[model samples]
Target: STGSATTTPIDSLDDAYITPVQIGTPAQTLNLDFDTGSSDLWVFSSETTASEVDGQTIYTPSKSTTAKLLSGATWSISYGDGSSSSGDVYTDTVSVGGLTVTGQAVESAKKVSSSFTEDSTIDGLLGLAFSTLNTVSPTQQKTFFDNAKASLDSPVFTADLGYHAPGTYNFGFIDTTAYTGSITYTAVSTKQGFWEWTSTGYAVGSGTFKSTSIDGIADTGTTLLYLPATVVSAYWAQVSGAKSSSSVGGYVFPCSATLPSFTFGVGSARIVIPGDYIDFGPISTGSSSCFGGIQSSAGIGINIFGDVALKAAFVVFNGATTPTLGFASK
Candidate 1:
């Protein structure tokens, strides 16, 4: 089986990508963030506090004949920040694109962070990362991708994120028409429950490629690319009026400054991110300085090649027994 879904940016800054999903018997459609960083197919639901419910869609299990509560099962996921969500679990018929998974664990949120409630663009998140990261206690549940793998023509999914445009997430097979040239397959380590890989090196704009091994995860949930301070500083150095501001909490530069492109190597393949892509967006409304899409990952522990980098290429998350990642130009 094969399936496809369109992903759209939540805002002009491309903060997050959201895709519509159908859950339950009658198909309760909700726009969910297809996050590759976390593992838990959770959503806003009838169980959520009324006060916590903003302008978001809520899935009511009672309305679906197929929805069955996972007795005594509960799950919770906390972010690095104080924000978090937790709730009871249920098994429902969940479908993405045309791919359907019966008895798919659907976490119904009892509580959500203010940040999530305020964002009316997305009802919740559909985790694509390995299930080892699932937060359900006593009985961990498989992610949507994992459960769909057996039925998929190929145990793989591809993310083709776009810049200020709609992108696609293809499951089961790689759409050859979606990418240019051949794919560069690389080993992926799910050690930490992430699609982690080691990049060969990097180069700033037209500068010479620096030989350095950088380890990171391909996280679609993250809005920006995060690397070591050294690599991040190198790229920002090429831009005039750029500075790491304590007030801004990251490197920012004059909006009018000419920004250089960023390139990272996957084996022998070089994926170049356009200069404008790095000029994330203005720090504030009508501000003169803009926040950078690439930031230092020093304190974050692991570097993250987020949407800012993923949008520049086609990414394949191969879920074979021997998992691997594939990248290609688009």
Candidate 2:
């Protein structure tokens, strides 16, 4: 579990909802999703000629005097949205914040698309959730926690959810000042990298929504919170005048009234989904309405508690001390 201190600094890069930190000096920034569902730090690169690679940042080995390419090996990744990127392997020095690591394995896409090419802001993805999803073979891939384990005085990696701003998820050494009480910890499930758990129920207003118990997984890769049909229907039932609309692909409720407050239990932590989150609309057309937190993903096997849920809590993935997740207030 212990290793030599990183020789490269972790660089920070912006990728839509997730913020990736550079992992080496001379700065080769990787745009990582920090997904709880997967655990590898992957990046898009010039080797990839695929269409999906557009708007996505591609690392040109020629651009970096320090970039090293690997021969005879191929890397490809597919997302649930049917989008993917593929390329060859490479190694280079990487940095993040003040931390550094060298000879880190990286992926370079051979083909990319306009969506990936045009996005000058989004760089690559850094996955820091759990080790089960590590893609590196023999040793598996060393994650931010895995690489930083030896250097950090405390064997912990904390996520400052609200530090930079709402929807901003910052990773690094835990800031003790952010939490006022002893940190609450939960053991990692025996399953793979997916952070799955059961919700005891929901809390509406100051009262509890006794009948709304549900089971689901927490995923950082997804943008919205997805719930089952039964739960979604029940939630909308309490919204008064809420109706299903095909245009938005989900239920839409008038924003004229105060929306109901809801919270889901994660172990001992009860994460509250603020009312504004439901009424998040200043649409160019139609009256402002409450958006559905739950959508249909019937065959997807599990409901996903995406960024909408993570933004409310300080999530930590402990790879060194214990394979566990710690949640606290930022």
Candidate 3:
């Protein structure tokens, strides 16, 4: 099945976001943060200005004699966090795992911000999240999945995110061997670049929020669970002695006790998030000890189930078959 496009919240150091994917040859690595928010797959280029592409891993096309560049097309992408970069399109023999796909689309950033220029830990983004909003399109628009689909044992891809580990995000050929036989699948609504669906209702601790019968979207591009104010307030109210505390320009609650497990019903599937996901860092400075799950988006209309929620389940993206998303155990 064809993999569908969806927004995923990834770990970003300044302007660089980490995606999981294999790069290079024989040494196929698992889990690299590639962006689906933008279509470009860029590693720092040698020609990139030293001041601009300082700490980033520049993919030396010269290293791979087979690499080729698409003439005339220039690409630039800006994130909601105000980070941006620009570069030219290129093609190279890129491989993910054992699957080697020639003529893979990539970008060579000529100009980037200090953020992209400085961090050195990660190499670059794989950008396999979705196809519609990619940086490279029609002309040279092939995603890693676009190439791997034809060769995969099964034409399906699943992303299993880790809580606080390096391999938090994973992709490529779903390992059916890991399943217990039965798994629930949901149809994905074709809307923009996000894999959206209707959420039946929400539950916090033992208190259930009134059914808004709201249509929800699962996005990995966002970090926190953005819910309506009414829903957000209802959730916090159920937590024992949970009080509003300020941190990162938002409100959080500080408590040593475990928060209630919240579940969202979608068709026959239930997406559950632990209460710890909602705890902010600390009551004082909001250290890094609090929940990172739920948050209030007072004005935004739609609720977003970010990485915090996505990490709870093994998600399948079947873009080729019925364009549906299947949820199962990690």
Candidate 4:
């Protein structure tokens, strides 16, 4: 009724965490980035061009007799950073921990955008969003979670992210031992294929929390916590030598600068991100410069509560009936 998987971040990479998944009859294992932002189980596959394969593992559907090609279907996905991937579709068995889903659609990449190619190590993306967001044309595919939900103990999944440390993703069952205190729940707005929730207000350092209505998404795929332009500027103005860097595409400051703590409001409770978390690893050849993990979501129009924000608290993603996000202090 439940399943679990451990995820580990790439050392010094400052990227999304990776989890191992088994596919096919004999179960070919692949390291995939479990992304809650989008719905599409895309992977590097034998269908991928030899030149594009590089050092990554590729899925070979032919090797598994159970695999079936989905005729007349194709998938092309364009990401937030303008990265994209396109491929054919196949149905195969997918397993995470002890849970298995049969005949789940897996997109086999024949072509990946330059951005995906640059990542080098990511084999695929295991989407946690609803099936409506899947990219396959002619016919869309259901996500592995949706296919298995009927048998789960509870139609829920929990994201227990760590501070640049390995964490676990629990499916169906909520592991009470993962966090402390009571979880505060927020209603979700999923018109956009993300876990969008509205927070009452937030604060920088010890500043008084303003009742600003902040609407955002909880995206593990995104690396930073993005807020409005004004909100971002307010935080940076408090720091010495902190300024916008067009070249860096984010706010940068002296590495030694004492950063301020950030807190987001969820109901009557507040979840705080430590100063150390705001100092996203260093940038540039010289280690003297570091980027601010909290950036402006000006043009994007949607703020993102990425790993830096999610790791500060325990998150329970409720998918049954009305999708809701339950947060608690970690």
Candidate 5:
């Protein structure tokens, strides 16, 4: 048997994206962020404070006839943005789109950080990273993809994202029509439970390509693509008005400035980030200033090819042999 789910990216206030998941008996459906940065399937639940719940649909394990509490088990998670969640664990049936998995650990958040408590739409994070990163002690958890893979036609998942449009996340299958040209594959280095890769060169506009290598992770959970200070300095140099701004956060420039396109080399294949796309949004929309979505990776340990770079091409998170990644024009 084979199964697949199509996720829709919601870009309202932030660059957040979501996919609907069905959990527990009688089916408790919630829109979850399919995060590849970590490995955990936690959700907002009845355990959360009423004031903090807001518009999020919380899961009630006791109401589900089949849901079972893990007695003393508990889990907690913190994000790069300082958001955090912690609560007791429950074992229940979980489904994505229409796919199902039995005995999955659902961490019901009893407490949450300010960022999550305010994000009314995002119920929880369905981590797509390796299971080794699962937070459940004594008995770590397995993600839906890992549990569902045995029955899938192909042990692979695809991410197709668009700017200010509906994006799709396909699991256990691949649709050839979703992309153009052949899928160019590069070997993945996943030592830290991330789909990490190395850039061969950095092409600034039409200028001569900088022959160098930069290490980064393909993180779907992150919004912007993060590079180094030296690399970012080079790109911003092309725009006359671009300058580093502490007040605006990251880098800022005039809205009227014409930014040059950037290309990240992946061995033989290259993915281009359009100059127009680099202008994420106005610093405050009404303001003429804008922030560069391609910011300096800086203290983030490693560079990240997040939504800004990822959305430019169709991506394949191939778990086949040696765990490779495939990229193609969309």
Candidate 6:
């Protein structure tokens, strides 16, 4: 079987991608951030405090006949920013696009920090990373993709993230029409609970390709592309007047500045990110200084190829016995 769904970018910065998911009987739909960076399909629910609910659509387990409380089960996840959310668990019928999974564990949020409460854009997060990363205690739960793979024609899914527009997420089979040229496959290590893979090298604009190994995870949940300081600075160096701003907290340049494209090697294939895509947004409303979508990952310890890089190509998260990632130009 095959299933398809649309994921749309939110806000002017294209901060995150939201996909519609249905939970329980009668189908309560909620816009969730389809995050590949972590594993835990949690949602704001009736258990959440009214003050923390904000504008998100909450899932009420009591309303679903098939909803079963997973007694003794609980989940908690913390972000790098110190914001965290924890909740109890409930097993219910969950569906995305046309794919349905029975007894899917849905973490119902009981407590959430300020960051989550302040964001009214998404109802919750639907994790797509390996199940090993699931936060559910005692019995860790499988992700929607993990559970649905058994019935799918192919145990794989693809992410086609768009630049400000709506993108498609397909399961079971890859749509050859969606991409151009043959895909370049690379080995993936889930040892860290992420879609971690290594890139051959990178080039700034049309410059010579630097042959080096750059290991990083492909995270749809992250907003920017983060690489080594040397690599990031090299790209920014190409843009006149570009500088690291202490107040802005990243590389910022004149909004009218001519930015250069960024290219990263995937296996033997090279994917190019247009300069305009890196022009994340103005530092402030109507400000002439624009923030960059690419930044230094030195502080982060590990490199991350976030949406800024993923949107430039069609990516495949192969869930075979030995997982691998496939990238192709779209």
> In terms of lDDT, which candidate is strongest?
1
In terms of lDDT, which candidate is stronger, 1 or 4? 1
TM-score of 6: 0.98
For candidate 2, the per-residue lDDT at 4 reads 22
Off by over 4 Å in 1: none
Q: Better model by lDDT, 2 or 6?
A: 6
- Per-model C-alpha lDDT, please? 0.94, 0.58, 0.60, 0.88, 0.84, 0.92
| TM-score of every model versus the real structure | 0.99, 0.78, 0.80, 0.97, 0.95, 0.98
Best by TM-score: 1
Residue-wise C-alpha lDDT for candidate 2, range 89-171, written one tens digit per residue: 66766655555667666666565445555554555656565666665544455666656667666566555443124333323
Per-model tally of clashing residue pairs: 0, 54, 36, 0, 0, 0
Output the TM-score of candidate 2. 0.78
lDDT of 1 by residue, 304-323 (tens): 99999999999999999999
Q: After best superposition, candidate 1 residue 49: deviation in angstroms? A: 0.9
Candidates in order: C-alpha RMSD to true structure: 0.8, 5.2, 4.7, 1.2, 1.7, 1.0
* Cα lDDT for residue 108, candidate 5: 92
**Candidate 1 vs 3: which has more lDDT:** 1
Location of the lowest summed lDDT over 10 successive residues in candidate 5:
5-14
Better of 3 and 5 by TM-score: 5
In model 1, state the lDDT of residue 6: 96
TM value for model 5: 0.95
Query: Which pairs in model 4 have colliding backbones?
Result: none
Q: Please provide the root mean square deviation of candidate 3 (C-alpha atoms, Å).
A: 4.7
Q: What is the lDDT of residue 205 in candidate 2?
A: 55
lDDT of 3 at 234: 78
